[PDB]
Amino acid sequence: QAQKEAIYRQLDQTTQRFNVGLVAITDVQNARAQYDTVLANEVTARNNLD
Amino acid sequence: RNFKEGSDIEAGVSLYQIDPATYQATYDSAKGDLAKAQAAANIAQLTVNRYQKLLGTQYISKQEYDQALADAQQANAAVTAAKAAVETARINLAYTKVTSPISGRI
Amino acid sequence: LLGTQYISKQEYDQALADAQQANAAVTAAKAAVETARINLAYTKVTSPISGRI
């Protein structure tokens, strides 16, 4: 969960760079991709949770 | 010699001509750096301007934004520097010549 | 490079930065070169006017 909190805000800021142009989308997609894996990660836990 | 000998002239109306050739480029030399001055500084300007938008956002790292904002601060100072360089040159280029701030019979 | 957003507009900014100022340095140069050359033009004294010497 905190991972997402961390990894999302990153991805969150990353777009802000692409919003500032400070990143390209490659940073973005991967960053987004980088994020999504987090989501992929977490759900399993809850899955595992149950 | 631009004037009419023995005529009366206004102030600073330049009736002679030095050869600007040396200085004229000399003025340019500063005019070059000023551009270089504004250039490097302008980019700094954009840099802070971008970062400023980061302000309150994540990566900004108040130190770092400050780093550029300095660079903003720092670069523009150089901007002021070159501008004078242009200025000193210009006043050394259009300096020539007319004339004894006084406006009178030549 | 910016054709598909592969860099940082910041970055490209920086690139143009020097590319901007670089030529200005060039300008600082050609201005320089002419300077001495002008002096070399001073050498080889030109009659500033025409007439019987």
Swiss-Prot record, chain A:
Places the protein is found: Cell outer membrane
Top-rank taxon: Bacteria
Observed effect of gene inactivation: Cannot grow on efflux substrates novobiocin or fusidic acid.
Protein family membership: Belongs to the outer membrane factor (OMF) (TC 1.B.17) family.
Protein function: Outer membrane channel, which is required for the function of several efflux systems such as AcrAB-TolC, AcrEF-TolC, EmrAB-TolC and MacAB-TolC. These systems are involved in export of antibiotics and other toxic compounds from the cell. TolC is also involved in import of colicin E1 into the cells.
Domain remark in the UniProt entry: Forms a continuous, solvent-accessible conduit: a 'channel-tunnel' over 140 Angstroms long that spans both the outer membrane and periplasmic space. The periplasmic or proximal end of the tunnel is sealed by sets of coiled helices.
Subunit structure: Homotrimer. Part of tripartite efflux systems, which are composed of an inner membrane transporter, a periplasmic membrane fusion protein, and an outer membrane component, TolC. The complexes form a large protein conduit and can translocate molecules across both the inner and outer membranes. TolC interacts with the membrane fusion proteins AcrA, EmrA and MacA.
Protein name: Outer membrane protein TolC
Range within the parent protein: 149 to 198 of 493
From Swiss-Prot, chain B:
Any coiled-coil regions, as ranges: 20-94
Record has Transcription as a keyword: no
Subcellular locations according to the entry: Cell inner membrane
Gene Ontology cellular component terms for the protein in this record: plasma membrane
Any one biological process term the GO annotation gives: response to toxic substance
Record GO terms (molecular function): transmembrane transporter activity
Record's keyword terms, sorted: Antibiotic resistance, Cell inner membrane, Cell membrane, Coiled coil, Lipoprotein, Membrane, Palmitate, Signal, Transport
Function description: AcrA-AcrB-AcrZ-TolC is a drug efflux protein complex with broad substrate specificity that uses the proton motive force to export substrates. This subunit may act as an adapter protein that links AcrB and TolC stably together.
Quaternary context: Monomeric in solution. Homotrimeric; interacts independently with AcrB and TolC as well as AcrZ. Part of the AcrA-AcrB-TolC efflux pump.
Family the UniProt entry places it in: Belongs to the membrane fusion protein (MFP) (TC 8.A.1) family.
Name of this protein: Multidrug efflux pump subunit AcrA
Source organism per UniProt: Escherichia coli O157:H7
